[PDB]
Amino acid sequence: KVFGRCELAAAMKRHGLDNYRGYSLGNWVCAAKFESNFNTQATNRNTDGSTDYGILQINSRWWCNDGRTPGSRNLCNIPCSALLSSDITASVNCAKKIVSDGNGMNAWVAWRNRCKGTDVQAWIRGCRL
Ligand SMILES: [Cl-]
Ligand code: NA
Structure with missing residues (x-):
């Protein structure tokens, strides 16, 4: 499945x-x-x-x-x-274990290089949550 931005949010x-x-x-x-x-x-x-x-x-x-x-x-x-x-349940439950292991979201190389220190709120702008 290829999610839409707000759908995944x-x-x-x-x-x-x-x-x-x-x-x-x-x-x-x-x-x-x-x-x-x-x-x-x-x-x-x-x-x-x-x-x-x-x-x-x-x-x-x-x-x-x-x-x-x-x-x-x-x-x-x-x-x-x-x-x-x-169904993203398994991915999410595993990600929760990864992000808790001491290094936070730095485990994800793309997050470190392309998301960290940017205005990430823009990624959920306009979504109905
Ligand atoms: Cl952290
Ligand atoms: Na393995």
């Missing part, structure tokens, strides 16, 4: 991401835009052989199992394919 809000660990809704929408272009089916492979999955591009090296990343962990205890569903 409303979905994320319903799943408890607004101000989660102090990060306003606009931060999450901005990260999803630049990680996956709002596409739940996005995949990208990394140099070390791990793969990133879904709307928030969660990495198989640490967070999910894809059966082909040797010596990796599975800290969200899910198959990586569950992160590609049109």
